[PDB]
UniProtKB/TrEMBL annotation, chain A:
Gene that this polypeptide is encoded by: LOC107764876
Family the entry assigns: Belongs to the eukaryotic ribosomal protein eS30 family.
UniProt keywords, alphabetically: Ribonucleoprotein, Ribosomal protein
Bias type Basic residues, positions: 24-39
Protein name from the UniProt record: 40S ribosomal protein S30
Organism from which the protein derives: Nicotiana tabacum (Common tobacco)
UniProtKB/TrEMBL annotation, chain B:
Source organism of the structure: Nicotiana tabacum (Common tobacco)
Family as reported in the entry's similarity comment: Belongs to the eukaryotic ribosomal protein eS24 family.
Basic and acidic residues biased stretches: 31-41
Biased composition (Basic residues): 42-58
Lineage top rank: taxon: Eukaryota
Protein name from the UniProt record: 40S ribosomal protein S24
Interval of the full protein contained in this chain: 68 to 130 of 133
Region feature (Disordered): 31-63
From TrEMBL, chain C:
Protein name: 40S ribosomal protein S23
Annotated GO CC locations: cytosolic small ribosomal subunit; ribosome
Keyword Lipoprotein part of the UniProt annotation: no
Pfam families: Ribosom_S12_S23
CDD domains: Ribosomal_S23 (cd03367)
Keywords assigned: Ribonucleoprotein, Ribosomal protein
Gene (name only): LOC107816169
Gene Ontology biological-process annotations: translation
Domain of life: Eukaryota
Bias kind Basic and acidic residues: ranges: 20-29
Protein's organism: Nicotiana tabacum (Common tobacco)
PROSITE patterns the record matches: RIBOSOMAL_S12
From TrEMBL, chain D:
Gene field: LOC107805765
Stored NCBIfam families: PRK04051.1, uS4_arch
Comp. bias regions, Basic residues: 171-182
Keywords for this protein: Ribonucleoprotein, Ribosomal protein, RNA-binding, rRNA-binding
Lineage: Eukaryota, Viridiplantae, Streptophyta, Embryophyta, Tracheophyta
The protein's assembly and partners: Binds to the translation initiation factors TIF3E1.
Xref: Pfam families: Ribosomal_S4, S4
InterPro entries: Ribosomal_uS4, Ribosomal_uS4_CS, Ribosomal_uS4_euk/arc, Ribosomal_uS4_N, S4_RNA-bd, S4_RNA-bd_sf
Annotated protein name in UniProt: 40S ribosomal protein S9-2
SMART domains associated with the record: Ribosomal_S4, S4
Length: 52, 63, 141, 183
RNA sequence: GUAGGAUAGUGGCCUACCAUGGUGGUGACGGGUGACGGAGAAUUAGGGUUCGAUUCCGGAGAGGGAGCCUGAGAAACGGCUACCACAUCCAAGGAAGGCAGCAGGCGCGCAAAUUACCCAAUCCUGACACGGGGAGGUAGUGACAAUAAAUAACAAUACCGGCUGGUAAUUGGAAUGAGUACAAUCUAAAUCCCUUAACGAGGAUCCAUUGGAGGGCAAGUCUGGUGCCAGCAGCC
């Protein structure tokens, strides 16, 4: 006695999800410079890398 | 940069060069004139002339 | 015990040959039955959408998995193909042209979807991934 | 028949067997950052070369000491290692080949050498200088950082004669600024 | 087996007569192969497993069979003859066919490029030093596969951590190739590469993507939405 599931429900959550714009951020360096940043962050300057 | 390599030929005289050198190399030096032709057109003309016998064969390939 | 006679090479070879058939992987690739299956030994196959169908998820999950009934063009066989991603069934219509790939487990059902061994990769010549990300648009005709 | 088909080619590296070993990842990142490499593929290529050399040496060491094949190939390999600075004259045994590390090969890169002799303020500066045609080994301009410098050619490294840092004709930026300042 | 015929020649290859022989669980015979064979390819403790249409070697075929002329050499097919299947033209009486050659088209499919230039190189061929060669080469399309390798480097200032390092769309001048283009070079002629006048970088907009973040397996007990729905999830 409910409306559990059906074909008409396709796209429910994606349609419901409010749209949020992507923040404009400066591009990261590529290649050797990217590796340099990673090495400095993980070894030189310095819990997980994405811990809160 | 600043350096290059190549091959050079010096013939005893111009006639020997004209007698032994390739046509394109002679053209590059101005000793010969390039003749404009199309190989496909030559082939088509030859094939057309194949079907005609006698003196008229000469103009048969034109078509 | 094993046979060990120096002149018993024939028996060892024959015994291994006979016992290889007990191996399911060996038998699958040596019985010549792959050509009677819907894909007939191909990675992909094109087909026409006949009908959208909802398949209940297996226990302990509860969901309606969206799938399409597709007839393969090259042999006329009918299969069930899963349509992945949210709301991607809306990009499928009856009589549409779809490219079908395997579900990743080499002819066996995946996850909580029962009896489904295929998925839709493209619809009307446009990949479902591009449609989901709005990179491309489904052709009008 | 297409004659080009007879040219042969080969791979130069392999991917790690286990993609996500934390200790391996840390060590590789440390090496890449120390030597200023652009990606893990360069390190894996150097590892591939080192593994090939070590496998050859290990194969040779299995043969009898008086085996002519062992003598010939061991002399060839030792000469090859000596030419490129991997091994020192005292290191005159195939056994010392097995004691070679990826760092030994990395230290022979034109980028590392350019950084070490003092032509660059940093390894990345050496990389950009090399790829910008500011460095020459002998009389030949080299723009490949992976260039492996031999012992004889090490002392000939210098600035390109056609570059601002080696001769005249400053760069386009300097010329533009000079022209702008002329008014 | 004997004697002949035929063949370039041996041989039941065929004919006449004669004898009953020949193969087979050490698998004959029959069947399947999405089976041309090999040199080789992938993977590599060793042993092994899987692949081999395709550029080298050998065989076979030219829509399916069969027969044959010429010729040193063919049971030839960019040769002929007949039948079978397809199929173009016709003034309806006839007449002409063979892309599993190079391009290209239809069809088929998950699945594969230009109806280009040239004999300059390699070589072949003819009466021939010279002609011809879709063999072969050049160029076009080409993220099959493989190689090297950009997307930034350095100082000042301000923050931080111990003169030493890290960060900043703050400041400062230097360097350079992607691009563009005289020129030369390349090339059979072109084009590309290499070289190089004059241009070509600050949010260096000259803006790196593909997959992931519970475990296997590297990476959030962050925030909003949904609420066994939608969906995810190779496995759990
Ligand atoms: K259920
Ligand atoms: K559940
Ligand atoms: K004979
Ligand atoms: K006989
Ligand atoms: K065969
Ligand atoms: K003849
Ligand atoms: K063709
Ligand atoms: K030629
Ligand atoms: K995981
Ligand atoms: Mg006889
Ligand atoms: Mg073969
Ligand atoms: Mg076949
Ligand atoms: Mg082929
Ligand atoms: Mg062959
Ligand atoms: Mg034949
Ligand atoms: Mg045909
Ligand atoms: Mg025929
Ligand atoms: Mg024939
Ligand atoms: Mg033909
Ligand atoms: Mg022929
Ligand atoms: Mg393809
Ligand atoms: Mg590639
Ligand atoms: Mg970019
Ligand atoms: Mg983890």
């Amino acid at each position: 006695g409910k409306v559990h599931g059906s074909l008409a429900r396709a796209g429910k959550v994606r349609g419901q999800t409010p749209k949020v714009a992507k923040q404009d951020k400066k591009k990261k360096p590529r290649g050797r410079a990217h590796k340099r940043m990673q090495y400095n962050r993980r070894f030189v300057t310095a819990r997980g890398p994405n811990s809160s | 940069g600043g350096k290059s390599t190549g091959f050079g030929l010096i013939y005893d005289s111009v006639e020997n060069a004209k007698k032994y050198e390739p046509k394109y190399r002679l053209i590059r030096n101005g000793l010969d004139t390039k003749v404009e032709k199309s190989r496909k057109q030559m082939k088509e003309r030859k094939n057309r002339a194949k079907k005609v016998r006698g003196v008229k064969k000469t103009k048969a390939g034109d078509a | 015990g094993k046979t060990r006679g120096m002149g018993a090479g024939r028996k060892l070879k024959s015994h291994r040959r006979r016992q290889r058939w007990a191996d399911k992987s060996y038998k699958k690739s040596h019985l010549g039955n792959e050509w009677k299956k819907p894909f007939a030994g191909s990675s992909h196959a094109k087909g026409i959408v006949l009908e959208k169908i909802g398949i209940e998820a297996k226990q302990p999950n509860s969901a309606i998995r969206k799938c399409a009934r597709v007839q393969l063009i090259k042999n006329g066989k009918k299969i069930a193909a899963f349509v992945p991603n949210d709301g991607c069934l809306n990009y499928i219509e009856e009589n549409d042209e779809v490219l079908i790939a395997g579900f990743g487990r080499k002819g066996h059902a995946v996850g909580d979807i029962p009896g489904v061994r295929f998925k839709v990769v493209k619809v009307s010549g446009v990949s479902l991934l591009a449609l989901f990300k709005e990179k491309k648009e489904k052709p009008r005709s | 028949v297409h004659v080009a088909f007879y040219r042969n080619y080969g791979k130069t590296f392999k991917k790690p067997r286990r993609p996500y070993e934390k200790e391996r990842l840390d060590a590789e990142l440390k090496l890449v950052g120390e030597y200023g490499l652009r990606c893990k593929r360069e390190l894996w290529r150097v590892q591939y070369a080192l593994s090939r050399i070590r496998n050859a040496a290990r194969m040779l060491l299995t043969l009898d000491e008086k085996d002519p094949r062992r003598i010939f190939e061991g002399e060839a390999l030792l000469r090859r290692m000596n030419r490129y600075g991997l091994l020192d004259e005292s290191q005159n045994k195939l056994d010392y080949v097995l004691s070679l590390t990826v760092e030994n090969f990395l230290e022979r890169r034109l980028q590392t050498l350019v950084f070490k002799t003092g032509m660059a303020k940093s390894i990345h500066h050496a990389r950009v200088l090399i790829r910008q045609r500011h460095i020459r080994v002998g009389r030949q301009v080299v723009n490949v950082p992976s260039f492996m410098v031999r012992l004889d050619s090490q002392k000939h490294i210098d600035f390109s004669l056609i570059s601002p840092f080696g001769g005249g004709r400053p760069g386009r930026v300097k010329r533009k600024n000079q022209k702008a300042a002329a008014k």
